[PDB]
């Protein structure tokens, strides 16, 4: 019964996505419509600035990508993926792209602004989240991954740094630099070292299952306060990931441990989210027995934590960064490479 309604939701959600996917929105604003206030982050590539749209007085987070820097880092195809996917999608725990445009020098992606900061800041500061607090957030990622994978999208960069906390204490996934629409396998080495599935490390050719492995890393990090595999250098992290051993805090409930052994499973035929019953092997698990999935989607569950509102354009929940000027050259750079943007 439950599953047939999920099916119906997802079929309607796919029709919506396809229209925007085959016909992307393009050139929907211009830089001179925004007042630049402050740099509030750096992503996989580029920088993100608090801005204010003059015509509405809305505040937004604008990501700026230097087209020449993107070509040198061989991210052309990934940045086109990123804007094409983000303009097409629509789900409550995905940050919304409000405008996109480009000029002679840069690409711009203007997104809704979450003044509360990201899970990284809050997690590091308090040390670790309780299990109920961790499950509240995990549940949102489980549904989001359910939404994305049904559209044939792999996300490929789950980590606390990419999860914004809204004014209701719910998540928005906020960086799509590696998101990709693929049916079947793909091979690019990308993601963040602590979060990489063993099949990525081993140049093996992978699918959506790497997102579920990354979920296991996230849950563990939220509940332990540190990642399951850590070291001072990436190569030392990769050895630990491929070894196939993992150790849990003594405070993890036996159900948490058993969820996590099934997500951090090196064996792809045994890894939860991958099997015949897909996402329901996760959703029906015991660690999740208290979770009401519809109440999470609707935002009826009480959030464990609500960031302090110090205004629509307050930036105290982000760190300070170096301010680079936006330089727009008088000549067009990389026109052909980015024509579809």
């Amino acid at each position: 019964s439950e599953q047939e309604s999920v099916k119906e939701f997802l079929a309607k959600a796919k029709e919506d996505f396809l229209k925007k996917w085959e016909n992307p929105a393009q050139n929907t604003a211009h830089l001179d419509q925004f007042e630049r206030i402050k740099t509030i982050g750096t992503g996989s590539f580029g920088r993100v600035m608090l801005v204010k749209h003059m015509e509405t007085g809305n505040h937004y987070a604008m990501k700026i990508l230097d087209k020449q820097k993107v070509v040198k880092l061989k991210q052309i195809e990934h940045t086109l993926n990123e804007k094409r996917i983000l303009q097409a999608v629509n789900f409550p725990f995905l940050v919304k792209l409000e405008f996109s445009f480009k000029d002679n020098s840069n690409l711009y992606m203007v997104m809704e602004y979450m003044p509360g900061g990201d899970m990284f800041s809050h997690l590091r500061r308090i040390g670790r989240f309780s299990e109920p607090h961790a499950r509240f957030y995990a549940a949102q990622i489980v549904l989001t991954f359910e939404y994305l994978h049904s559209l044939d999208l792999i996300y490929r960069d789950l980590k606390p740094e990419n999860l914004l906390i809204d004014q209701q204490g719910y998540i928005k996934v906020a960086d799509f630099g590696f998101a990709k629409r693929v049916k079947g396998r793909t091979w690019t080495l990308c993601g963040t070292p602590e979060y990489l599935a063993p099949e990525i490390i081993l140049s093996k050719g992978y699918n959506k299952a790497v997102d579920w492995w990354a979920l296991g890393v996230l849950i563990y990090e939220m509940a332990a306060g540190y990642p399951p595999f850590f070291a001072d250098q990436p190569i030392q992290i990769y050895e630990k990931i491929v070894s196939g051993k993992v150790r849990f805090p003594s405070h993890f409930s036996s159900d948490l441990k058993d969820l996590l052994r099934n997500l951090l499973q090196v064996d792809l035929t045994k890894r939860f989210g991958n099997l015949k019953n897909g996402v329901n092997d996760i959703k029906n698990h015991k660690w999740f027995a208290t979770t009401d999935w519809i109440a999470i989607y609707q935002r009826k569950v009480e959030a464990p934590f609500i960031p302090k509102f110090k205004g629509p354009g307050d930036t105290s929940n982000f760190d300070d960064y170096e301010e680079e000027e936006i330089r727009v050259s008088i000549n067009e750079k990389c026109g052909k490479e980015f024509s579809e943007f």
Partner: peptide, 20 residues
């Protein structure tokens, strides 16, 4: 403790994505 080893490690700040 494991928490103490992590907190003394060089990877407690924001982690960059990797690539080819």
């Amino acid at each position: 403790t494991t928490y103490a080893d992590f907190i003394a490690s060089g990877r407690t700040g924001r982690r960059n994505a990797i690539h080819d």
